[PDB]
Amino acid sequence: MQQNFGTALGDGFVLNEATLMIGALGSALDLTEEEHSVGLFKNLAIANDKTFQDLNQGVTQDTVHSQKTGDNWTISGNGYEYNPRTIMYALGQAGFTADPTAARTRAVVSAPAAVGVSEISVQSATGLAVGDWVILYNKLGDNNGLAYKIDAIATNTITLDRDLVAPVAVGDELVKSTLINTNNPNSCSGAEYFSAKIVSADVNCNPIVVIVPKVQITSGLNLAFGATDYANIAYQMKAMALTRKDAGYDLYVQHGKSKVFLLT
Amino acid sequence: MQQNFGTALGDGFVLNEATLMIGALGSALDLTEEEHSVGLFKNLAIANDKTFQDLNQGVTQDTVHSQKTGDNWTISGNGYEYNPRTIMYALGQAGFTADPTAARTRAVVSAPAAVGVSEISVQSATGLAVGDWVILYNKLGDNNGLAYKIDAIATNTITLDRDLVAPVAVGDELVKSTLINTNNPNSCSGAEYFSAKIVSADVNCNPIVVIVPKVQITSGLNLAFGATDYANIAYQMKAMALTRKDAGYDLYVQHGKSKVFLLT
Amino acid sequence: MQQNFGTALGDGFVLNEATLMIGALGSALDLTEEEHSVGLFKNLAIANDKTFQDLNQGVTQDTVHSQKTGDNWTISGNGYEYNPRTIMYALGQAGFTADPTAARTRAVVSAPAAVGVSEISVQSATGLAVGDWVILYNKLGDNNGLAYKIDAIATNTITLDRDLVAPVAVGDELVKSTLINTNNPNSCSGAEYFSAKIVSADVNCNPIVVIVPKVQITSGLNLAFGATDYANIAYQMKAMALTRKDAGYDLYVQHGKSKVFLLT
Amino acid sequence: MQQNFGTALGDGFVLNEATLMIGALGSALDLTEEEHSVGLFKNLAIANDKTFQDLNQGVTQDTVHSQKTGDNWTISGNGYEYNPRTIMYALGQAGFTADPTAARTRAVVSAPAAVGVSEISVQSATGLAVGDWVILYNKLGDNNGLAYKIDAIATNTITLDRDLVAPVAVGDELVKSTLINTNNPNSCSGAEYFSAKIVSADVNCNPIVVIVPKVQITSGLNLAFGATDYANIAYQMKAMALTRKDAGYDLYVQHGKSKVFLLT
Amino acid sequence: MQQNFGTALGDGFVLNEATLMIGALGSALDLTEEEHSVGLFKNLAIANDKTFQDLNQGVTQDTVHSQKTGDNWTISGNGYEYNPRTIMYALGQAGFTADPTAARTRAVVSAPAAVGVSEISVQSATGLAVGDWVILYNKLGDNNGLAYKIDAIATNTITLDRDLVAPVAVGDELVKSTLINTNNPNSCSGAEYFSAKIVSADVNCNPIVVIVPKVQITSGLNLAFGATDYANIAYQMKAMALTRKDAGYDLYVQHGKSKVFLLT
Amino acid sequence: MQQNFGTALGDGFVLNEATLMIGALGSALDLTEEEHSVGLFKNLAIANDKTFQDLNQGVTQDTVHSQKTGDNWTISGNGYEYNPRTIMYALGQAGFTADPTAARTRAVVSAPAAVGVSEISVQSATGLAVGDWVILYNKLGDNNGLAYKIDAIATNTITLDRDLVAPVAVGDELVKSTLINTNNPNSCSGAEYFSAKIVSADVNCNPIVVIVPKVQITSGLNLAFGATDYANIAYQMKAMALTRKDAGYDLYVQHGKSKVFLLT
C-alpha cells in the first residue's frame, strides 16, 4: 500500500561535460571546435542571479508590486592546457588567432660560442626568421632560462639582440618560442568582448546548445606550480547586453533581447 | 523503577518525499501530477520565519506588548530533469504549457551538402514545419553544435536560415529542438505568479496536502557539468498575499487570509 | 601519595530526557501528560543569559557598581510527530484543543463518478458530517492529492463543494482530514501566551519539575522531506513576565516575581 | 655531536584537576571542601587578559611610553551535579547555605484520594512540616509531575494547598522537594559577590593554592537533556577589585592590591 | 631528458627547537641558560609584519613612491613548567631573580592542635623563618588547601598569623611555599622591559643566535587543568625601539638602530 | 553512440616546480641560477587580479562602458634554506651579494681562559680577520650562544670586544659567523626594488620563462621552530610599473608597458 512521491516523468537527466567555444563578436552561432575551442575544460557551471524590488503596505508588509532590477549570468571552469591560445584567452585577449597545435623548431649549434659574443652558428636556419624569439637549451649545466631575439640571419650565422652571459657549446639547441605581453596597448579601455557557445548532451544523446552573444572575461592568468597535481587555470565570464553599435545586435533583438538562449 | 520521559502519544511520523505541483493562478486546488508536476524532486523543505516587535518597560525590560510584523514562507528543493517545462519553471515562466514527454523527430540526409549552401535534401519532411529549430548531428567528426532554423520546405528540400560553415555528408541527422529565451518581453515587470500544491503521506499512508494560492520563483537557472554526479537545479519559492484583482482572492479570504493552509 | 582533586560530594547526576507540557494561561501547576503533552520530544535544553551594567573609575577601570539589566529564558527541542495538536503548537496556536489519537473515517465509493459531476455515492455516511474535509484516495493511478469539502449529505449521496477534475471509480476511498489555517483572524496582534511545565528525573529516580507561568512560541512550522532520516520540528520558546491583567499573576508575585522556579 | 635546545631545568609540571571553593565575602583563606566546594568539577581554566595604551612618534611609530589600562581574570569549568547548592551557585545566589547530601523523606499513602479533594492520609508525618513541598509519585500511570505545598498537618491527615486533578491510590509516595526561585527579591541590584579558592598539585605532589578575594558569577543556569552523555553546567566567574566598604579590604591592600595571588 | 627545477644550492636546513633566555635590560649579549632560561619551551616562532604607504597616479594607479610605516617583531611559544620564575615571567615581572631548582622544607608536627589555636609544635624549625608561608598537608582527610604565615618562632613552637579552622594531628607536614602577587605596586605604569636571546642550530650543527635588546611581554598567566594532557603557558613578546635613557642604547645605534639582528 | 565533450586539443600540460631568480634592477633577462637563485623553492604561484568600473543605464542596469582600473601581479612560495642570502632576500635587502656555499672557519683553543679576561689563544688565525664575528662552541656544558667580535689579532692571541662571562677550556672552538641587521640605514624610505625571473617546463620539456622587470618583496622574516617538520620561509612579491628614472625602462616600453611578459 506504500506510495512513491516525487517520481520522474521523463528521461532528460544530465551526466557529462561541456565544451566551451569563444570567438569573435557577431559569430556566436558559427563557432567550430577546432578553431574556437579552449581545450581540456572541466567543471563548467552556469549561474543566474536575479534581484527584485518590492513595495509593501501594512504592518505585516503585504507586497503589492515587485519589479526586477537585474539578472546576471556567469560562466566558470578549469582549463588544463598552457599554450598561446589559452594564455591569451585567460589574459582577456583574442586567443583564437593563435593555434594550440603549432610546432617548435629546435635548431642545432655547430660551433662553440664564448661569453661576450652576439653571433652563433647553426646547422640550418629553416623555420627561423628575423624577429623570432629563441630559448637556449643546454645539454649539460643548470637551466638559467635565457631568451634571445633574432636580429639578422646571414647564411648559417644568427645575430642575437644582446651579448651572451653563458657559453654555448656544440650540441646545444635553440628552441623557438612565442612572446605574450600581458598589456594590450591598442585597447583604450582594456575591456574586450567576445561571443561564446556551450555544447553538451543528455544521457540519451540529445544535444544541448547554449549561445551567449556577448561575454567579458573578468578573471586573470593564474599559474600554480607543484608536484601534487596538474596545474589549471580558473576561468570566469559574464554576459552583457548588446548595444546598437555592437555586432550581432540583430540576433539580440530577434530573440527578445535575451542575454542567453537555449536550444534543448 | 526507571521511568521514561518524552515518549510518543501517537503514530504520525513522516519519512518520505513530496511532490510539488505548479500551475496557473486561481487553480491551486485542482492541480494534477501529469499536467502540473515538476518531475524528479528531492529534499523538499518548507520554512516559516516570524518577526515580532516588543514594547519594554523598566530597567529589566519587562515586555508589556508584542506585535507580529511579518511571517514568510519559503519552498526549496532539487530537480533532476532538464526538459523545456523544468527550464521554463526555473526561469520564472509558465512551464506547464510545455510537455516533458515530447518526441524529437530525427530526419535523415540523402544528399551531401558543401560549405556555402543553404539548402539540404532529407528523406521525408514529416514532423518538421516552417520556423522549427534543428541541430545537425554528424556521425563522424567533432561536435560543433550547429543549430539552424527552417525557413521554407518544398518537396524534400529544406532551406535553412543561414549558409553552412561545415559540410554535411550522407547519413547525417537533423534533430528537432525547442528554443527557450531567458527574457520574456511580454512581462512589463518581470515577475510572474503561480499556484502551488504539495502532496505527501505519513508512515501509515495518511495523506498530507499543502496548498499555496500564490508563489513567486526567486531562483534562476543553474546548470553545472561534471562527471562525478548527476546535475540538478536548485529551486526557491516564496508565498505572497493575494489582492483584490488577483485570481483566487475568494479562496484567500475564505480561509482567514492565510498564505498557506494544511490538510492533515 | 597521589591526591584526587574536584571529586564528587553527592549522587545527583542527570542522564535522561524530559517531557514538555504546554497548556492554557493560569494552569501551569495542573498540566497533565495526556491532555497537554507535545509527544516525542528530543534534546530539550534550557538556557539563561544575564546582562550587567558596570560603573568604572580610574585608569585601570575598577568597578564600583554593577546593575542587572535583564535575564532571558529560552526553551528548545525537536518534535517527531505531525498531528493537528503539534502543528497548532508549532504555529503559535492553542494546540491542546485538538487530539493526537483521533481516528480517520475512510468511506467506500459504491458508484463510479465521471469528470464534471459534484455528487458521489458512498457505502455509509457514518462519521462524516456537513462541512468536513475529505481527501480522495485512488487505488490505481497517480496521487494528485485532491481535497473536497462536504456541502450536503442526503441518504448515501454526498455533494462536494466543487466539480471533479479526475474520475472516481468503484473501490476508491474518501479519507477524512482536518483543516489547519496558518493565520489566526481572531488575534489582533498575532501573539498568544501559554503556560509550560517540564518533568524529568535524576539517576536515582528523584523527580525534577520546572514551571514557567508564561511562555511565547517564537518559532514557526518547519517541515523537511527526505529519505535519509525522520522529519522533525524545531521548537523555541521564551519566558516573559506577567502583568496585572494576566492570569496567574498571584502565583507570579508569590514566588518573588520569578519567571522560572524549580522543584528539585 | 647533536645538541638539544629548549630542555627542562626542573620538574614542576602539572597534570591534574583542581577543586573550586566558593564562600562568603571576607573568608577567602578559610574555605573548606565539605562546606564550600562545588562538587564534580571538570576543565577548570584561569585566563588573564591585559590591555596597554601606547604613545608613538615618527613615521615608523617608535613607542615612547606604554600604560596599562586594565587586567581581567576569568574562571570557567563544568559541573556535573544538580542539587540545591549547585543550582543556587549557578543562579548567582548563596549556595553554601544548602547541603548536597540532604535526604528526601518519601511518605506512604494509606488511603485512596479522588479528584477534587485537598486532604490525604499518610502512614506517618515524620520529616514533613508545614510549608514543605512534596511531589506526588504514582506507581502506575504517566508521570505528570505534580507538586503540592503542605498547609496543615493534623494527626495523619495532610491538607494540600490546592485541589487534586489526578487520583492518588494506595501505595503512592510523596517525595519531599526544595523550592528554588530564579529571582532574588532581597537584592536591589541583582549582583552578589563571593570569595573563591582553587586547590591543585604538581606531579611531585606539591600543592598549588589560588585565592581570589572577590568574584562575580556572570553565567546562568544551563540544563540540557539527552541520552548521549551526562548533563553539566558551564560556570563563568570574574575577579573584581575590593573597595573600602567591602569585607576583606585589609587582605586586599596587604598584598599590593592584587585581584589574585598564588602560593606555589 | 627530464629537468629538475627549484633545487637546493646548499645544506642550511633547520629542524630543531630553540632556547629562549630573558634577562635584565642592557645585558642582551651575556645571557646564560642556567640563570636566564625559561625552561621547557616548545613551538618558538618569530614573526615580522611590515606596512607600506604608496602614492599612486593615473587611472591604473601606477605607484611612484612607497614608504615604510612600521615593522613589528613578535615572539611566541609554549612553556611546560610551573615554578616561581616562569610564573613571574608570565606575569610580566622580573623572573630571573627566583630559582626553578629551589627546595621545599617539609617540617613534621609532633603535637596535635585543635580548632581555635594559633600555635603549633614541630620537630625542628630548620629552613623556616619569620614571614614565611607554609601550606598544611594532612595525611588523612580532604585537602582544603590552607596556607599560613609564620609570625614568630620560639624554640619548637610556631605561631601562625590566624586561628586554625581544621585540626592538625600528629604526623602532618608543613610544606614551605612562595607567595606571588599578580600586581606590582612599585611600577607606576605596569609595563616592564627586558632583554631576550634565542639560540638554535642547523642540521649540520651550525649555531643560530638571535638577539633582541628590548622586549615587552604582552601575554598573561594562563593555567588550564585537565586529565588529557600536560598544562602549558602561552607566551607572547614584542620588540621595541630603545631610547636615550634606556640601557643598551649604544648597542642599538651601533647596529643601525635594528630591533633584531641575527648571527647565522 | 556516446560522445565526449571538453576534450584536449594539444599536449601542453604542466606538472613540475619552478625556479625563482632575483637580481639587480635592469638585468631581468640575464639572471643565472648560481648567482641569483633563491634555492629550494616550493609551491610557486602567480596570481592576477583585475578591477573594472562599469557605467550602467536603465532599471535593469545595462552596461554601456567598462574601464579597467588596475591589474596586480603577486608571486608567492616557500623557501627551505636559511643562509645569509635567503635571509637578506626575506628582509627586503640585496641578497645576491652574499653566497650560500660559503665556509665556516672553526679555530681551536690551545690555552684555557677564565672569567673576566678578554684575550684568547688559538692554534692558528687563518681565515679570521679584524672585525669578524665568532660564536663560542663548548664541548661540555650548556649552550649559552655567546658571540664575540674580534678587535685585534696579534700572533696567536685574539682580543675580543667584551670580557668573558663563561670559562673557555682547551679544545673549544670559535665558529665564524655573519652579522645580519634587520634595519638598513642607507635606505631613506625602506623600499628596495629588484628584478625577477621564473623558469619551468612542460611535460614535453618545453621551457617556460616569465620575466618581471620590477618587483617588491612585501613579506618579512618568518622562522618557526619545531620537531614535526622542516622550517620554511613564506615569500611574497608584487610587480610594479617602471618610471623614467628606473633602470630597464627601455625594456618596459618596448613590450607595450607590460609588468609581466611570458615566453611560452
How near does any CA of chain F get to the CA of E107, in Å? 35
DSSP state at residue F183: S
C187 and C259 share one domain: yes
Of A133, A148, A177, the residue that ends a domain is A177
* Position D3 in a domain: no
If asked whether residues A138 and A242 sit together in one domain, one would say: no
Q: Residue A19: what residue type?
A: T
Closest CA to D259 of D20, D46, D28, D73: D73
In this structure, what are the phi and psi dihedrals at residue F15, rounded to the nearest 5 degrees? -135, 95
Does any domain span residue B147? yes
CA distance D254 to D261: 11
D185–C257: do the CB atoms touch at under 8 Å? Answer: yes
Within a domain: A196? yes
User: Is residue D139 located within the same domain as residue D249?
Assistant: no
List the domain range (segments joined by +) for residue C173: 107-177
Cβ proximity of B79 and B233 under 8 Å = yes
| Residues B91 and B215 occupy one common structural domain | yes
CATH number at residue F111: 2.40.30
Q: How many angstroms separate the CA atoms of D114 and D165, rounded?
A: 9
Cα F187 to Cα F194: distance, rounded to the nearest angstrom = 14
**Which amino acid belongs to residue D240?**
M
Quickly tell me which residue has 628596495 as its cell. Answer: F192
Q: Are residues A187 and A259 in the same domain?
A: yes
The answer as to whether B134 is a domain residue is yes
From the number of C-beta atoms within 10 Å of its C-beta (0-12, 13-18, 19+), residue E245 rates as: exposed
Cβ within 8 Å of residue A94, ≥6 positions away = A24, A88, A192, A194
Q: Is residue B10 part of a domain?
A: no
Name residue F118's amino acid.
S
Q: Among A123, A154, A177, give the residue marking a domain's end.
A: A177
Half-sphere exposure of A25 (CA within 13 A, CB side): 19
Name the minimum distance, in Å, from the CA of E136 to any CA of chain D. 9
The continuous run of DSSP H or E covering E84 comes out as helix E84-90
Secondary structure (H, E, C), chain B: CCCCCCCCCCCCCCCCCCEEEEECCCCHHHCCHHHHECCCEEEEEEEEEEEEEEEEECCCCEEEEEEEEEEEEEEEEEECCCCHHHHHHHCCCCHHHCCCCCCCCCEEECCCECCCCCEEEECCCCCCCCCCEEEEECCCCCCCCCEEEEEEEECCEEEECCCCCCCECCCCEEEEECEEECCCCCCCCCCCCEEEEEEEECCCCCEEEEEEEEEEECCCCCEECCCCCCCCEEEEEEECCCCCCCCCHHHHHHCCCCCCEEEC
Q: Are residues D189 and D80 located together in one domain of the fold? A: yes
| D35 and D92 housed in the same domain | yes
Cell numbers given for E171: 604526623
C-alpha cell recorded at residue D117: 479533594
Structural domain ending residue among the three candidates E125, E142, E177: E177
CB contact (8 A) between residue A70 and residue F52: no
Of C19, C49, C59, the CB nearest to D220: C49
Distance of alpha carbon B40 from alpha carbon B79, whole angstroms: 6
Sign of torsion over alpha carbons B58, B62, B65, B69: positive
DSSP character for E87? Answer: H
**Using an 8 Å Cβ cutoff, are F93 and F181 in contact?**
no
- Contact list in C for residue D190 (CB cut-off 8 A) is 67-68
Q: Are E2 and F205 in contact (CB < 8 Å)?
A: yes
B-chain residues near A4 (CB < 8 A): 17
Question: What number of helices (H) and strands (E) belong to chain F?
Answer: 3, 15
User: Does residue E14 sit within a domain?
Assistant: no
E89 and E191 fall within a common domain: yes
- In whole angstroms, give the CA distance from residue B96 to residue B109: 34
CB-count exposure of residue A250 (10 Å: 0-12, 13-18, 19+): exposed
What cell does F182 get?
634587520
Q: What single-letter amino acid sits at A12? A: G
In terms of Cα–Cα distance, which of C98, C48, B46, E227 is closest to D92?
C48
**Does residue F188 belong to any structural domain of this protein?**
yes
Which helix (H) or strand (E) covers residue C244, if one does? none
Chains F+A touching (3+ CB pairs under 8 Å): yes
B217 contacts B174 by C-beta, under 8 angstroms: no
Clarify whether residues A187 and A93 are in a common domain.
Answer: yes
Helix (H, G, I), strand (E, B) or coil at D30: helix
Taking residue D105's Cβ as centre, other Cβ atoms within 10 Å add up to 16
Say if residue E205 is in the same domain as residue E241: yes
Q: Touch between chain D and chain A (3+ CB pairs, < 8 Å)?
A: no
Cα distances from D16 to residues D204, D205, E42, E226, in angstroms, run 11, 10, 21, 6
Judged by CB atoms closer than 8 Å, whether chains meet at C133 and B15 is answered as no
Which of these, B138, B78, F264, lies nearest to A82 by C-alpha position? F264
Give domain status of residue C3, yes or no.
no
> Strands C207-217 and C194-201: what pairing?
antiparallel
Q: How far apart (Å, rounded) are the C-alpha atoms in residues E239 and D60?
A: 13
| Residue F214, all three cell numbers | 620590477
User: Quick one: DSSP state of residue D256?
Assistant: T
What is the C-alpha separation between F220 and F217, in angstroms, rounded?
Answer: 8
Name D166's Cβ contacts closer than 8 Å, sequence gap at least 6. C32, D115, D136, D138, D141, D144, D146
Q: Which residues have CB under 8 Å from D25's CB, separation 6+?
A: D193, D194, D195, D213, D214, D246, D247, D248
Both E94 and E187 in one domain: the answer is yes
Solving technique: cryo-EM
Q: List the one residue out of F79, F31, F27, F72 whose CA is nearest residue F51.
A: F72
**Do the Cβ atoms of B33 and C142 come within 8 Å?**
yes
Distance from CA of F251 to the nearest CA of A (A): 12
Contact D222, D233 (CB under 8 A): yes
Using CB atoms, which chains have 3+ pairs under 8 A with A? B, F
Q: Do A182 and F261 touch (CB under 8 A)?
A: yes
Pairwise CB contact (< 8 Å): E17 & D8:
no
Contact (CB, 8 A) for A248 and F66: no
Question: Considering its fold, how many domains does chain D have in total?
Answer: 2
Residues C212 and C87 in one domain: yes
